Amino acid sequence: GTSKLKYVLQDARFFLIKSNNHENVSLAKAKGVWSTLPVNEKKLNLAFRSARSVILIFSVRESGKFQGFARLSSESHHGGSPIHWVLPAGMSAKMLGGVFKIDWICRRELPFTKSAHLTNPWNEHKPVKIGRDGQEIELECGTQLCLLFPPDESIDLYQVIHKMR
């Protein structure tokens, strides 16, 4: 193991991403990308410049689980390869902001039952599973949440560490 993981998470910022469906998380995992609404895009871009790592922790709504976590490798950009997201009913692709590149750190799931002892000070100390899309997770809570995930032995954090700057 957990030492490189702890190194990547040191002084990181953490954001809860609430996905409407599994398809979008599958796309994010396959293509290494995420796109969010402008209100959250602006926050993530600010955070990316502010901290050595910005971690997105994903949860599919109504799944009762987190599906993994990833580190931003870029601010958002426009004009790249299109992504055929399955958007919420009533939302068009033009309503999204730009695309963030992300490097997955863990593609394994974690059930909410395992995080019940973790509360988020930045959301009224409610259990960390509770939060709107884009809710920031305070450092200690976010670190402990990430350390609860099963180790993902398919991941080598060597290349992620070299991106930290």
Ligand X SMILES: CNC(=S)c1cccnc1
Positions that interact with ligand X (CB under 6 A): 20, 24, 35-37, 85, 87-88, 96, 133
From the CB of 86, what's the least distance to ligand X, in Å? 7
Residue that the structure tokens 């209100």 belong to: 39
Q: Any known ligand binding at 20?
A: yes
45 annotated as a binding-site residue:
no
35 annotated among ligand-binding-site residues: yes
**Strand (E) or helix (H) holding 135:** none
Nearest distance, CB of residue 36 and ligand X, angstroms:
4
71 bridge partner residues = 55, 103
Whichever of 19 and 53 has its CB closer to ligand X, that residue is 19
Per the CB < 8 A criterion, the answer to whether 16 and 133 are in contact is yes
Which is closer to ligand X, CB of 102 or CB of 146?
A: 102
Q: Give whichever of 9 and 27 is closer to ligand X, judged by the CB atom.
A: 27
Decide whether 24 or 120 has the Cβ nearer to ligand X: 24
Q: Report the alpha-carbon distance of residue 62 to residue 47 in Å, rounded.
A: 27
Minimum separation from the CB atom of position 5 to ligand X (A):
26
Is 104 annotated to bind a ligand? Reply is no
- Degrees to nearest 5, angle at CA 130 with 14 and 62: 110
| Measured CA angle at 50 (ends 122, 13), to 5 deg | 40
**Dihedral angle sign, alpha carbons of residues 151, 49, 91, 129:** positive
> Residues at the annotated binding site?
18-20, 34-35, 85, 133
> Residues at the annotated binding site for RNA?
18-20, 34-35, 85, 133
